[PDB]
Write a protein that binds this ligand. Structure first.
Ligand SMILES: [Ca+2]
Ligand code: NA
Length: 259
């Protein structure tokens, strides 16, 4: 049931980090879960600092919300920023101080693929407006895996590419007119890129859309609340049909409605 985004609900807090290491981070579920995981499995990465390698895994939502991890994975190289996603059994993340995306299969703890995103800025060239080295943002939608970035040729405007999830080859690329550094974050729903106007405001908006199927850009005014005033991560999960976000220690989720 695809369509255009028309409404975002109030943020619901599912878990709050207890230390500064989790001021910013990424949490996520796999929209294409594979053995030994299920649609309830949740992963959490607290991303403050310079040697981020611990991935917390929770078999059950109850454990994610109230308990300790059921397993901790140690990544084979440090991860950069908050843009990572889970897809079909693999964590897709950016290597620290690089433009390299790594496909890391959690059940075997093996690197299955690596790819330098051609021309992508990294390490503070084209971050979102809050900084945080957020130059490269992976995304999953109804059609699969994407990457959101920019390049010198695009003059800092958001570029998005569809990725082959097995080998990380770029399959198609689109260039928007939206300055990446001017928006707080972005995500993709049903092939349309959406941006958020501010990471601090209780009265932010989903403010731009770019439809990859038609090439048309639009402005929007859909209200979006940053309840804790510092949103470092905003992604869409196409299985739950919800936004997942990280806001100033808090792992939150927003309902949505599509036309
Ligand atoms: Ca995002
Ligand atoms: Na992401």
């Amino acid at each position: 049931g695809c369509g255009e985004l028309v409404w975002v609900g109030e943020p619901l807090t599912l878990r709050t980090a207890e230390t500064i290491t989790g001021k910013y981070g990424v949490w996520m579920r796999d929209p294409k879960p594979t053995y030994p995981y299920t649609q309830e499995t949740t992963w959490r990465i607290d991303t403050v600092g310079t040697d981020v390698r611990q991935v917390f895994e929770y078999d059950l939502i109850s454990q994610f919300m109230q308990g300790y991890p059921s397993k901790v994975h140690i990544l084979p190289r440090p991860l950069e920023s908050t843009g990572a996603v889970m897809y079909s059994g693999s964590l897709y993340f950016q290597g620290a101080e690089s433009r390299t995306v790594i496909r890391y299969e959690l059940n075997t703890e093996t690197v299955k693929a690596e790819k330098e995103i051609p021309g992508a800025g990294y390490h503070g060239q084209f971050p979102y407006s809050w900084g945080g080295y957020t130059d490269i943002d992976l995304a999953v939608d109804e059609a699969g895996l994407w990457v959101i970035y920019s390049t010198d040729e695009a003059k800092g405007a958001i570029v998005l590419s569809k990725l082959n999830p097995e080998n990380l080859e770029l399959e198609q690329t689109w260039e928007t007119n939206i300055r990446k550094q001017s928006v707080a974050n972005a995500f993709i729903i049903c092939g349309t890129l959406y941006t958020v106007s501010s990471y601090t405001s209780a009265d932010a908006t989903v403010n731009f859309a770019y439809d990859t199927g038609t090439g048309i850009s639009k402005t929007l005014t859909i209200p979006f609340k940053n309840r804790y005033k510092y949103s470092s991560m905003i992604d869409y999960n196409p299985l739950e049909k919800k936004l997942f976000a990280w806001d100033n220690l808090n792992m939150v989720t927003y309902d949505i409605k599509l036309s």
